[PDB]
Design a protein around this ligand. Sequence first.
Ligand SMILES: Nc1ncnc2c1ncn2[C@@H]1O[C@H](COP(=O)(O)OC(=O)[C@@H](N)Cc2ccccc2)[C@@H](O)[C@H]1O
Length: 555
Amino acid sequence: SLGGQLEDNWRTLSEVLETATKHNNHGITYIRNDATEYFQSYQDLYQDALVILNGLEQKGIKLGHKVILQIAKNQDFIPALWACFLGGIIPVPLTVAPSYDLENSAVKKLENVWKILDNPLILSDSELITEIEKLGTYSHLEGWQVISVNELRKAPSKIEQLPILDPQDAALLLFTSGSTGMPKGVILTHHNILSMTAGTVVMNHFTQQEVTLNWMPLDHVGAIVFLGIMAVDLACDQIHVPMELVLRQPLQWLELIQKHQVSISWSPNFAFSLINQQAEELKHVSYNLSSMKFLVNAGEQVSVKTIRLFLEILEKHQLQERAIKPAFGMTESCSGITWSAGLSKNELTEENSFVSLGKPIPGATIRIVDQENNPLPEREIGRLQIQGNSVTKGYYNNNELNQEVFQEGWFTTGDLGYLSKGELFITGREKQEIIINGVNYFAHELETTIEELEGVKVSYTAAFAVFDQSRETDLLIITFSPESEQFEQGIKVVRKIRSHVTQKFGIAPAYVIPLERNLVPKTSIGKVQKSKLKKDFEQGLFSSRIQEIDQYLAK
Ligand SMILES: Nc1ncnc2c1ncn2[C@@H]1O[C@H](COP(=O)(O)OC(=O)[C@@H](N)Cc2ccccc2)[C@@H](O)[C@H]1O
């Protein structure tokens, strides 16, 4: 149903980095937690990567082998990632766990992936090395080996020549958590990654003069590719900020855009809302954001009302018209695959209620089909299917999954939406629909509406529907985290949530469950995974709290 013509490029990642070294002008600027800065030119990165690569070789890690990445320090992660790229070693970046002595999904993912990949070596930093080894000994994991990047930097560097690689060979393996069970390992070739890069650059007119800024964790595809490898491909300046720095003080994102004259940046929808929360203090200070021309809202459903408010607040801070770029992407397509032309605030009205995520990059084709795999007419909801050189060819060691989601040269994303004049509009995700009396409801709207309320902490909210067997009816369940200091003072807001939702939508939440911030399940990028919360409810993990709240009501 779509298009885009792109000339074949047969570069590898090593050639891309080698091309970038000539521009000793540019490279990576690392922002530390204390807001100090450290510049590493592409030449320095290349030299650093070679040293680490030699360290890897000396430990017996060979071409084609896989290594797990568990590195929180950005100054260690990127050089180690590129080290693997140059040596033909496949890096497997995984989310750094919040702790390694307590039960969490990140610890489970690390152990599961480790088992799937036949006991590969784990790369860490000096801060985390001890904790990760402890987990290995405590859980008696046979062959568990962890090494710091700084120990690999010590390797007497007997550097030999770099291997010549096939761009069709695997270069990057990224595991995503599925709805249930084992994680899914997305295989990404050089050709996959560089075909996204080329398509995105040509379509959006990026040049070596760009300044990219990332504040998402480096294990995610958006940070590795769109705001990592792309910048290397362009040989432009790239900046990496730890997520917690911007979370602790959201306005620092705006400060860094101004200070570094940033032209390209990205966050999911919730972070836009976090800025909107700062509307008051944004009246007493002024930022200059005129350098920002490509501001990506991607990673989760985009809220019309949130974007509209974001423009109104920040146009008073020199944010140019059409700078905001809602986009669609996934791990399976090396992040971004469609890009908006920009928002003009005229599509944002009590409008749609769906934001356009734009047209696909050159080389890519997208379509909306029915259950029969037949293309549907424009403007009606169906399953999104994607193809092109930027799209993955298959998952790691999972034929059952490959045969299901890869058919006729198309990949089923598991996402729902429609096409209108060539532009993609995502409406929801499969098996997460909120249907009550045949009427379609949309989680993001509900969540946005909830998050307007005082006492509801932004980015910890979820809305989903379960079927109640006893009463033979569908229930709307709302989970949130209180903005109180602290819970359980967030009992007053439970009542406030139910009424506010009824007033605006005409339907009510059956249950409203407050949650401790640390227990709301989130992907590395901060997207609330509603599947894990649905399961938790059906156990039920919250039954005690539900009763306790119900006992507090009726008094
Ligand atoms: N703009 C969007 N609107 C609605 N849902 C989205 C959007 N972007 C991503 N998603 C959801 O997130 C899923 C992919 O999740 P992950 O594999 O964890 O990686 C991601 O979250 C990528 N979407 C990140 C990205 C995209 C574009 C540019 C930069 C960065 C998609 O299948 C879709 O369900």
